[PDB]
Design a protein that fits this description.
The chain is an alpha+beta fold and 145 residues long. It is built from 3 helices and 9 strands, in the order E-H-E-H-E-E-E-E-E-E-E-H. The chain has a single domain, classed as ph1033 like domains (ph1033 like fold, Roll). The longest helix is centred in the N-terminal third of the chain and has 10 residues. Bound molecules: calcium ion (2 copies). The PDB classes it as structural genomics, unknown function.
C-alpha cells in the first residue's frame, strides 16, 4: 500500500466529493500510474482568497481510499485551476474515509515529507500529488476530526 497527499483547491474539492474521482494532468500521469486500489489519499486545498479578498488558509479536508486502477477519461468535471481547458483525464476512482477540516501550516514541523521547513511550499509547487510517509499519514489521520 501507499499513502499520498493530493493537492487541489476548494472548487475542485467539491467536484471530488461529488464525483469520487481524483484526476491529474499529463505532466503528473507518471506519478498517478503508481497508485493502486487500497491506497489512501489525503486531500489538501491550497491557500486561496474569497471574493471579498479574505485569505483562506491551506487545509487538509479529507481522506479517501482508491478503488480503481488508473484510467483515462476526458469528461469535463473539474474547473481548470490555472484558467486553461485542462480536463485532468488521468484518474482513479475513490471513496471517502474521513471528511474534516484542519489547518495545514501548523503541521509542517512534524511532517517528514516536508524536508525544507523554512519554505514548505516548495514541496507543493508544480505538483498534483506526492507520496506520504506512513508516519505522516498516521499523524494527519489522528488530527483530522
Ligand atoms: Ca493548461
Ligand atoms: Ca494542461
Amino acid at each position: 500500500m501507499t499513502y499520498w497527499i493530493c493537492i487541489t483547491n476548494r472548487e475542485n474539492w467539491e467536484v471530488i466529493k461529488r464525483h469520487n474521482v481524483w484526476g491529474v494532468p499529463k505532466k503528473h500521469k507518471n506519478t498517478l500510474s503508481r497508485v493502486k486500489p487500497g491506497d489512501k489519499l489525503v486531500i489538501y486545498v491550497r491557500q486561496e482568497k474569497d471574493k471579498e479578498g479574505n485569505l483562506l488558509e491551506p487545509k487538509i479536508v479529507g481522506i479517501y481510499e482508491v478503488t480503481s486502477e488508473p484510467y483515462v477519461d476526458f469528461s469535463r468535471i473539474f474547473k481548470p485551476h490555472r484558467g486553461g481547458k485542462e480536463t485532468y483525464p488521468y484518474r482513479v476512482k475513490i471513496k471517502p474515509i474521513k471528511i474534516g477540516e484542519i489547518n495545514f501550516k501548523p503541521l509542517i514541523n512534524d511532517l517528514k515529507f516536508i524536508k525544507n521547513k523554512k519554505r514548505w511550499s516548495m514541496h507543493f509547487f508544480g505538483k498534483a500529488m506526492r507520496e506520504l510517509p506512513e508516519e505522516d499519514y498516521k499523524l494527519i489521520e489522528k488530527l483530522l476530526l
